[PDB]
Design a protein around this nucleic acid. Structure first.
Lengths: 113, 64, 51
RNA sequence: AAAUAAGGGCGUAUGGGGAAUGCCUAGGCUCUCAGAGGCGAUGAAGGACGUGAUAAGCUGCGAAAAGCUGCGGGGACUGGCACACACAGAUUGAUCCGCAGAUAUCCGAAUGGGGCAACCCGCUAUAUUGAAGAUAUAGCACACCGAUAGGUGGGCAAACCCGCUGAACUGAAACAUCUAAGUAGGCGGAGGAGAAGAAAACAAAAGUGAUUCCGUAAGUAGUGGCGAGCGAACGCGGAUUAGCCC
RNA sequence: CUGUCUGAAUUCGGCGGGACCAUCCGCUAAGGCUAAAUACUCCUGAGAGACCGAUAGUGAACCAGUACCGUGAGGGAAAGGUGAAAAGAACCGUGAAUAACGGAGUGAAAUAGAUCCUGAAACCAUACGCUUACAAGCGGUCGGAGCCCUUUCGUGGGGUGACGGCGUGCCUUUUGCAUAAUGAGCCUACGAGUUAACGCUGCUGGCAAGGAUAAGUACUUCAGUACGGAUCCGCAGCGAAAGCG
RNA sequence: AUGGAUAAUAAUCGGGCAUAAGCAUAUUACCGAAGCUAUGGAUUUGCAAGUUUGCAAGUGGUAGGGGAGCAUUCUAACAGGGUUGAAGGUUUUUCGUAAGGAGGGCUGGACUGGUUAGAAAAGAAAAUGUAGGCAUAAGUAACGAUAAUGCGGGCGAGAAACCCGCACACCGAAAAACUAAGGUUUCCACAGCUAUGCUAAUCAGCUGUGGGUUAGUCUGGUCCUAAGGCGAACCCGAAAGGGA
RNA sequence: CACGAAUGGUGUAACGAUCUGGACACUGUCUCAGCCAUGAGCUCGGUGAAAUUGUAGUAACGGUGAAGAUGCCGUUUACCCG
RNA sequence: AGCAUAGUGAUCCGGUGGUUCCGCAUGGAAGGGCCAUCGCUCAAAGGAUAAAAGGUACGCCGGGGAUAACAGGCUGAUCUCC
RNA sequence: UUGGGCUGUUCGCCCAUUAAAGUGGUACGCGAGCUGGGUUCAGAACGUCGUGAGACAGUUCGGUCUCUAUCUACUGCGGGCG
């Protein structure tokens, strides 16, 4: 018998086009331009997930360096004396302390120094 | 329809008892006076189709 | 310039008329083919004359 | 009234545009079972022109023109698509259906001559002013045979079948033998089928007894630039069965 | 079978049994007719479809071999749906207007009003919320204030997003393409490894030194149980063959 | 380290710039990948328990090979849903490794579909692919001989183009009259400005209604014949047919 | 290098929208361009296409690169729209 | 068979010698089969046929930057300069 | 950083001047800027090769150069905002 996939043919592309919502120009309504943009958007989203984990560590390191240079120190020497002291606090918590709790940060610095 | 057997392959290539194909040797036609008797004695007995040609010979003989 | 079709309602009938198709043996097969296909208009003689 | 960035971007809502999708059928496709396989000189197939209370088309019908008659069925509406203003017919039994009849213009094998199909022009008999211009009816082609009054055939149209002719592309990884293929195409005739059909036949030491078709035999024997390829027969099992005339 | 030439005997004769000869076997040419089983559908009556459903199915579901193209042979389209029933909008107003619209009546529906069932996408516009006139590139992604709606009240949801990091579309052909190598204006619909016959491998099933029927036939509630062993494969191979096994 | 010429659009340690932030050796800390590890989860083979779990080794991928599945149309059985609202269209939530499944609101107003098994016209983003619809170029080219127009009245809702009048201009061996070929009603009058007229139009070779073609002498037939055609009889050729 | 006698040899009055060289007259052909008129063009009112088109908010230099960059790297420049 | 490595040509077809191997009803025969052996500068020597040369600026179709002419790129043989 | 004669010429030789009459690159700059004189289209003829169809880095006469500027790049003129 004659089988035509007419309803699901468009129901499949509606779902792929609904996530191209907010795109400039015809990248949001035209099918062959939206499909080429949604796949590239998903390709960009697969990566940048490995980069979000190394772009935040850079910010943490910069904030730790800034908070440690206020006490006449450097990030390299501070991290060396912290790692060779049995502390084991990650850079996220260390930067959160350097930003929000300067008293706790300077206490850690004076204890490891 | 029915697969036709190639006559050139059916006049040669007699099938052996179990799974092999028996054929004759070449070069024993008209210049036999200068070839050694050793070669002419070796090229007299029947030979077997090699395993590299067995598939083609079987496809010609219609035994897939 | 001069085109290829210069009409003449006697040179047309002397070449494509009913009596010109019916005169030949192979020209009589055109009528059979057209009647088998179902052409509402047969040879150009079907065009109405001036009244 | 309000707002205002001249304008642009994004999101929501409401519009125009278009015809997809969903649903449906008026139409198509492949077949099964049982029939039939033709029409035409008493003028075919196919058309032209006409025909309505009203009528542009379609349908039906031919100057007897959406109709006439006979025999059966049928029992209240009917004057086709087609309605509306109307006008008429019809339980005395209309309209309608089945079968059998009548009329059936012109062209067309077209057949009185011709011709540019639907036109023109005639001869002989009769009648009309009969006489010039013209009219109404009938008969006027060809081939054959019938001895003579008269009979037969012209042409058209699906496939099957028969006879006469009959390619090339293609394949051979080129190409000429070969294949394609006695296929496509052309011409003529007949019937529901046609052709074939009753042994100057097979077979082999045993035998069968007309032809046709189905399954094996068999991709076998064989044939072939022994290349591509082509490819039986005997015997066996079934459908049907029928033999006769010079 | 013959286009041309030649050319026999009459039954102790003639022809055939795949060159030819002898023996055996079969038949009796140079005359004719013959139903059934067999092939097809311009048609006819009845009936079906794990057949199509308006770009499908016949070219043609509809004034289709039509409209259009050519001198001609010839080629050849597009075009279905209001509503249950036209009850198809009397009447009034703006308007020059029987152009259109707003009312009024019909309906269950008039955003079912004749472009008439539902009616999407491309495309063209209006209103509202957030941004945008010192800022350079496949226009996205990961972070990120601020401002608008909602709220089971939230390390809840939706919209816009100032600013920062990364990032030279897709397909095909290529050693190698952002390539300035090919291709596409966009959307909707159509569109390309399917079937028959004959075989081979993998899985599964029946029977098992045996396995299986074909054509056909009978019955019947009929395109759907019994019978049918003709025949095919396997069970023994070698040799060109006689042949042996 | 220094001198040993350099190329044509503006240049280079990548730039700022550095006398060390250059070079040579030695040391320490740190940064640094999808590498390794920490946490959670999924999957393929091999080994055991059973009827999913545990351990070990893995899990980039083109040509290509293998295994599990989704949707679509229809069919056979059992079990259903719908005018108290089916299919279809538009938004929203949730579930799955994905193809996809399920639920809610709005339009819509009659069909639809679960489980097991079966079949296939069974899935598009590209073929300078086909048909329909709609954009961009863009309110851009163009509006078709540079013979020419101006004013005043008329109908009219509406006049640069229509009608009338006065002026101007053009052709005039023509852009004048007849008519053949051809067209086949375009001819004339009245209503209309929808489509047609490359603009509007009250106008028209457009639309709808009523009319229009009169032959003894004109052109053809009834008269004749040329080129050529047909052609009884006759002569040829497989047939159709050819010559005459 | 490598003409040659009816694929004819050598001349020839007239002729040629034939090819080639030179002379007179004449001129915007030029030195060297200038001025004027109409149509097109420009603005406005009416009607209104097409070729082309993957999406685009579409810079320059030096370099890299399938060896000649609007889109890549570094620097420089650039208010938005016609 | 030569001190050893080169002195060569598949298949089809046809010829010669040997052979109760078969020989289409039977007995012969024609013919075929088996062994030995002959005929191919098939020299393009794994030989597409027994049998085969050119032009296209009148050309056409299908493809290639797999491959040249112009330009770009790499290197200087040549060139120019020191 | 000149103007002419010859040649399609680049080049080159010559004539008369000048302070000088430079060397080169930019797809041997520039044909959606111009011309088509040369070269590679179809016609014809000569020399030569080929039996022939035809050919020549041999010569001569003639022979259609398409496109309405989207983005950027330039030359000018405006509107909006700050």
């Amino acid at each position: 018998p004659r089988s035509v996939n007419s309803v699901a043919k468009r129901a499949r592309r509606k779902k792929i086009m609904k996530q191209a919502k907010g795109f400039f120009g015809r990248r949001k309504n035209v099918w062959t331009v939206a499909k080429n943009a949604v796949e590239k958007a998903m390709s960009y989203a697969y990566r940048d997930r490995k980069q979000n984990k190394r772009n935040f560590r850079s910010l943490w390191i910069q904030r730790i360096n800034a908070g440690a240079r206020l006490e006449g120190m450097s990030y390299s020497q501070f991290m060396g004396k912290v790692k060779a002291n049995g502390i084991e606090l990650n850079r996220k918590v260390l930067a959160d302390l350097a930003m929000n709790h300067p008293e706790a940060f300077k206490a850690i610095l004076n204890k490891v120094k | 329809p029915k697969m036709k057997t190639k006559s050139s392959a059916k006049k040669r290539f007699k099938v052996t008892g179990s799974g092999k194909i028996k054929r004759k040797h070449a070069f024993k036609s008209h210049i036999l006076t200068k070839k050694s008797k050793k070669r002419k004695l070796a090229l007299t007995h029947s030979a077997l189709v090699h395993k590299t040609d067995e598939k083609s010979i079987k496809q010609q003989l219609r035994i897939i | 310039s001069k085109r290829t079709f210069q009409p003449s309602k006697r040179k047309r009938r002397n070449k494509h008329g009913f009596m010109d198709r019916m005169a030949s043996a192979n020209g009589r097969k055109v009528l059979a083919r057209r009647r088998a296909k179902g052409r509402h208009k047969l040879t150009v003689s079907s065009e109405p004359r001036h009244k």
